[PDB]
């Protein structure tokens, strides 16, 4: 529970202008029905931790796409500012060409609905949200401004939520593909407990 | 923004009876002034994902303490249920002896203040909070019920927040001890961008 | 009148997950229409007075069932904690095999509806409620925490309310099956008064 | 919790004119500081269950007084009505000479404060309250109108509350003077459980 | 103007259990349509002025009944107390056999509706109400507790209101049957005024 | 219970211009401290029952003054209308000379405070109030318009209240100077009941 | 604008008992539809300026009626007081026979609706109101108590309003029948202005 | 009865820019302490009845000034419009040179305070107010728009109020200087009534 | 940003009496559907900056009319004052014959709806509003009192809004008919940017 | 009237991070005491009309500075975006080097305080505000998005307000330095009007 965002309930609906392959396009949550979505907010264009997180997610976008998961970034900056930043070379602090949409949240509606607006600055905190194929919010990750998130951890979480959805077993702490899972009932769970201890 | 918990503001205060070293004792946020705290809520004692997270954090508890970070677990279960679970062998689904405090939130006040109560069941979601030594909340991680968290990522985040506290530099996506950081100003950050791209 | 539970009015309905014969089952008050119900709340699993009350009601459960009365115990603990307690031998402070349903009130709504939640601890007081076959509350018994109730007195009261429901007479102080009763009108009551004085 | 009457809190204060040894006197709860009090409400003078409870408590009044416990009966009838009833022989449905005070709640303030007023009739339910020497409410017992209470059970409860106050042990289900008690801590209660099972 | 009672408006409707001819019976204002009603409230059974007023009205009940007027007495005492008082000899302060219904007002509804409750004692003041055959209130007489009313004045008033109802002349101060009346219009009233001065 | 007028509490204070011995004078309730007051309201000057009451009280003013009781009459009419009616011979339907003050309630404040206004006509009902020497209301008498009050009954009631104030005995129904009274306690009242029955 | 009386809006409806040629008659505003009404309030019957205004208006009533205007006087005094004053010779300060209805505003509804009550005394100020044949208020004249109005000015105003109603020209300051008027439009008004200056 | 203006209460205080002798000046009500004031509102400059009233008052200004009474005109028009109108010849509908201040009420505060705004047009009705030397409102005259006031009647009213102020006698209907007045008391007014009837 | 007036929303509707070609006519915003409107407020008739702005717009009225734009002036003065001002020669501070409507806002409703009232004076600030043919507000210009607006700038703005309405182009700073414009999209904007720098 | 912005009142205070001579600096309104300020909001960096207004004001900044007027631009974009745009060549749609401060309003506080936010897009309309040396708001110009403002007109207005401040004369419509002004009083304004007509 962050703003209108609640784990286990339909993620707050959104619609925004975004920069997609160097052009402007409308992006909305209902477009991703049947797909997982990683939605990540960041405070500001033309800053420091920011480009490193956007570039990391862009570099791994294909890994998420192989899981039927779309990655979307969003800040309060306009789509014109985003495009300027994509048109700035990475060596100069820019983003260069990107493989993920960058959404504009100029009214702050998306940030307010997801509960990540840092009100004394008017910018979003590093809030990352994982939404399943039914549009349900499954995970919330929010960091204060000085520390970047982990793309590997986001990937692990998407893999774990898909695993539990598809198999009806739960994922222990630190689960990664290949790791044992637990059948969530008193008697069937003893198979895990007896083997891991 | 989780219940009364807000990034960048004093973490909601808490006071509870906990099981510490096999005995009951009161634990409160003011006991940890000067140290980082990793407060992780979990839904129910005697369940499935739950013991795996608790044991993983207990097994790594000294790794956090060497950084001046204390790990505390909490559920709505009482201290008598917790002790009973601790006195249940790990191969039977128990916790065994533990190296971390296990707090009882029988009134649900801690769960309500941290905005993690799953209202229709009266149990906390998998909410993990990172609090600095000044008592300020720096990170929020909340997972839906079927998927466990990562102790490696909690440790990465505590390290990163401590690093930025002491150096005034910011940590890029994926940062781990030893990785490059950025100086957060337009001119000085050029050193990172030219090197990394 | 305790919370929403008022003598002479339908008892607050509920539904809960319970442990019944070692497995989980949904129990609803509205399921016992036609039978008397002794609903007894107790504060916490794995404590002291508590097992003695649960075991004493379990041991006498068939005496109540022979009268068409079902006994239900409830605490705020989960059904997993109840099962673990039932799985603990009586010699170790456990319940051992149980002959009555043990309900979980994890949301505290049953305790709040019956007005027995000790608010500052989040646990129920020792409140016992006698509900007739019409679902109507007939008796309220609430003890502070250090003192157990009496199963013999609960049985006496169920017998007395059944007797008065069935005959046109009222039950004097200390009535038990076979004791004299009184016909409640000025002239017919003299039969009783003539013999006791 | 009944009206303003809540377990573990100061019982609602009261003041009323009473019939005491055939004369009128004011009785107030503060008159009994340092003593236990059994306060029992009943619906109506010159009725049927009513005299059987009042006489049973008057006949056993010394059994309570030997323990430092005073018994007080109360109904909405005036002290003039109570006195006419005391002046009516027991064989005629009267009370005869009485060994306990009979309080008149003509304003209905005591019934309302103790939450036992049966609103559609303006008479009190059969509510009995055990109050300790510090003025704290310890037990609530309320019967619907056709069934009398038990003087033996009230006496057992007073004894038990007094025993736990004095020794700091707790009273199992069905405890009676002479019965074993439990020390309420996880270490010292183990011997109780092992030796009784 | 007393509670809901207003001169010239329909008397407040009432319904109550009463002692009539030694037995219990329901009495309600609508039973008396077409008849005058003298409704007299009194504070308490088994007291001092009270029996003198009840007996005086009872003794003269047929005098009112010859005028088509019914007299009803009412207090907050129950019907069981009223019957006990009727069954007590007058020499001992009792009422003896009664020739008027004695209504019970245990909920205090009638006293509240007629505005005569002495709220600091919960008992009715000495309020007497004269209601005509149309069900309209014609007269209010309320005495403080230490002074009894006059049955002779109640009768004079009933006669006077019935006289003015039938003839349309008005009754001067002190009128009694046989006395001069006034034709209420400027010219016709001189008959009276010239004669008397 | 009349407007702000309540038996047993200080009568509503009042100040009014009155006609006193053919001249205008200010009269206030407070002026009568230490004496009884009979305050009688009447609907309208130049009407029919009205002069008969005013004349009846004026003719007998000394009967009340010898008792330390003042009589005051009041209507909503002005002092000029009162004076015109005093200056009209009695044989013509006038008041002639008077021995009591006749108050003007042109604002209707007195009539409102005593709760006797007939709202749809703006005139007072025939309300008479007996106020003692301490300023406390003791008796309320209100007649509908067509029937006059009784000076004899007002005098009987003044005598009675004075006797009960002085002797601390209570007056039975119909009491008149010389009648037996009752000592208001259970034992001493037997003297009256055995004497009169 | 006075109370509910607003110039240019429907005059507040009224209905009252009046004295008309020595008898009592109901008078209501709807009886004057199609006619002008001069409604004049005055403070009190049997006073000083008052008789002079009522007499001045009655003496000239036919001058108004010849124009289709009715004159009505009103005070808070009753119809009996009004008839007493009409029955008092003009030479003794009375009204003598009258040629205009005198309305009784005993409930004060008329004076309150017209906003003329001197609230500290309960009497109307000298407010005079001119209502046209459509029931619309056209003129408000209010004098403090010591100064009487002018019948000549009231007549002038009725004549001027009737003139403007019929001709759609406006009446200059001081206009009297026969005086020049102005066509209220810029061009046509020049005929008045050039000829008068 | 007008906005904040009420007879017998201090006239609403005011201040405004006025045109005085063809120049602008501040005028405030406190300037006239000790003097009578005739304050007349009018709807609009450059209209039809309006100039005729202003000119009538201006032409007679010295008749009022000789009595210690100042005449003030006011509309919602500005002082610039007032001066333009003053600078327009009377033959063309102007005012010509003026001998009384003309107050500008551009904020409409004066008109709202005196209750004369015709709210749907934003202009004042023809309201004239007579204020004495103590600043008390004594007279209210309000005409609908089509009919002008009377300067002669305004002068008669000022003379009458001043006469009554100085002599303590009251002015009959139609009084003019030289006319008889009445001493307002029952005995001293008889001479006036006998002489005039 | 002005009262009810918001850029991008329907301009506040209005209806007013105006002077049009020396005569009075009602003017309303709905008469101008399909045409631009320049609505300009000014503080007071017969003042200083004001005629210069009114005359400037009047002289240039056909420059706006040829674009399908109507110019409307408005002040709080009445239409009578407007016309008097139009009838005063320009040489004396007048407006002379005008070629644009001059609206009267005597109720102040237009000035309040457009948020231009200077409340402590009751006059409008120098607010000019440009409304398109759809009735939408496009431009707000408001000056403090000492400084006149610019007719040339109002015309340039009207031209620019009409230009951008009809072409897929926006107007740079300082644009006039014939000047360069920019196509508002990233790629197409380059024609302007490379041509101008 | 715009948000908190009101002509004649203190301009809404502001404080912001700006870009000044290619670096970040704190800018606040109080820094400009004694100087005129032209504050101009614009919707979005990296857009179309936007650069043309910022460049025009920048190119003419010394024209303003020579009058002691400072020009400041503001948008909701961050100072990092502003720097980036300044660092973009003009031929590619950038700002190039700038001679005026560019303020960031990322919380939207300035835009909301000046009432210029287009709420559905979260960007400021083209609002320009002229604040004098005393901090008072003198002028408001707001354009819808597609049309730029005029630096020539902005300069005319600053010049006009400074002149009126300094000479106490007023500036006619269309005034430019060298044009005739008006002494704002009825008599001295005549020289201006006689000369032009």
Swiss-Prot record, chains A, B, C, D, E, F, G, H, I, J:
Residues 5-163 form the Thioredoxin domain. It comes from the Eukaryota. InterPro entries: AhpC/TSA (IPR000866), Peroxiredoxin (IPR050217), Peroxiredoxin_AhpC-typ (IPR024706), Peroxiredoxin_C (IPR019479), Thioredoxin-like_sf (IPR036249), Thioredoxin_domain (IPR013766). Pfam families: 1-cysPrx_C, AhpC-TSA. Keywords: Acetylation, Antioxidant, Cytoplasm, Disulfide bond, Oxidoreductase, Peroxidase, Phosphoprotein, Redox-active center. It is found in: Cytoplasm. The enzyme can be inactivated by further oxidation of the cysteine sulfenic acid (C(P)-SOH) to sulphinic acid (C(P)-SO2H) instead of its condensation to a disulfide bond. It can be reactivated by forming a transient disulfide bond with sulfiredoxin SRXN1, which reduces the cysteine sulfinic acid in an ATP- and Mg-dependent manner. Acetylation increases resistance to transition to high molecular-mass complexes. Deacetylated by HDAC6 which decreases reducing activity. GO terms for cellular component: cytoplasm; cytosol; extracellular exosome. The modification Phosphoserine is found at residue 111. One of its GO terms (biological process) is regulation of hydrogen peroxide metabolic process. SUPFAM superfamilies: Thioredoxin-like. The modification Phosphothreonine is found at residue 181. The keyword Oxidoreductase applies. The modification N-acetylalanine is found at residue 1. Belongs to the peroxiredoxin family. AhpC/Prx1 subfamily. Homodimer; disulfide-linked, upon oxidation. 5 homodimers assemble to form a ring-like decamer. Interacts with TIPIN. The active site is a conserved redox-active cysteine residue, the peroxidatic cysteine (C(P)), which makes the nucleophilic attack on the peroxide substrate. The peroxide oxidizes the C(P)-SH to cysteine sulfenic acid (C(P)-SOH), which then reacts with another cysteine residue, the resolving cysteine (C(R)), to form a disulfide bridge. The disulfide is subsequently reduced by an appropriate electron donor to complete the catalytic cycle. In this typical 2-Cys peroxiredoxin, C(R) is provided by the other dimeric subunit to form an intersubunit disulfide. This is Peroxiredoxin-2. It comes from Homo sapiens. The lineage of its organism: Eukaryota, Metazoa, Chordata, Craniata, Vertebrata.
